[PDB]
Amino acid sequence: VDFGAFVAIGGGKEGLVHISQIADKRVEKVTDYLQMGQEVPVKVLEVDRQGRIRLSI
């Protein structure tokens, strides 16, 4: 989505890569990183508001 991408890292657990932290450059709605079921490594950073883990590539 234009909010980011939800990686199912394992067992269907959603982690949100936020829109800016997908491409590391001009994102165009994450057009380069947009394909359902595409596997790609995602690294967690730290705890965030609402208990959500922070995710980026």
Swiss-Prot record:
Localization, UniProt? Cytoplasm
Deletion phenotype, per the entry, is:
Decreased growth.
In the induction comment, the record states: Expression is negatively autoregulated at the translational level via an RNase III-dependent mechanism. Induced by cold shock (42 to 15 degrees Celsius) (at protein level). At low temperature, the destabilizing effect of PNPase on its own mRNA is less efficient, leading to a decrease in repression and an increase in the expression level.
Q: Which residues form the S1 motif domain?
A: 1-57
Instruction: Reproduce the free-text note on domains from the UniProt record.
Output: The S1 motif domain is important for trimerization and RNA-binding.
The family classification in the record reads: Belongs to the polyribonucleotide nucleotidyltransferase family.
Query: What is annotated about its quaternary structure and interactions?
Result: Component of the RNA degradosome, which is a multiprotein complex involved in RNA processing and mRNA degradation. Interacts with RNase E (rne). Homotrimer. The homotrimer forms a ring-like structure with a central channel, where RNA molecules can bind. RNA molecules bind between neighboring subunits. Might interact with YicC.
Functional description taken from the UniProt entry: Involved in mRNA degradation. Catalyzes the phosphorolysis of single-stranded polyribonucleotides processively in the 3'- to 5'-direction. Also involved, along with RNase II, in tRNA processing. RNases II and R contribute to rRNA degradation during starvation, while RNase R and PNPase are the major contributors to quality control of rRNA during steady state growth. Contributes to degradation of some small RNAs (sRNA).
Q: Protein name, please?
A: Polyribonucleotide nucleotidyltransferase
| UniProt source species | Escherichia coli (strain K12)
As recorded in Swiss-Prot or TrEMBL, the protein's gene is named pnp
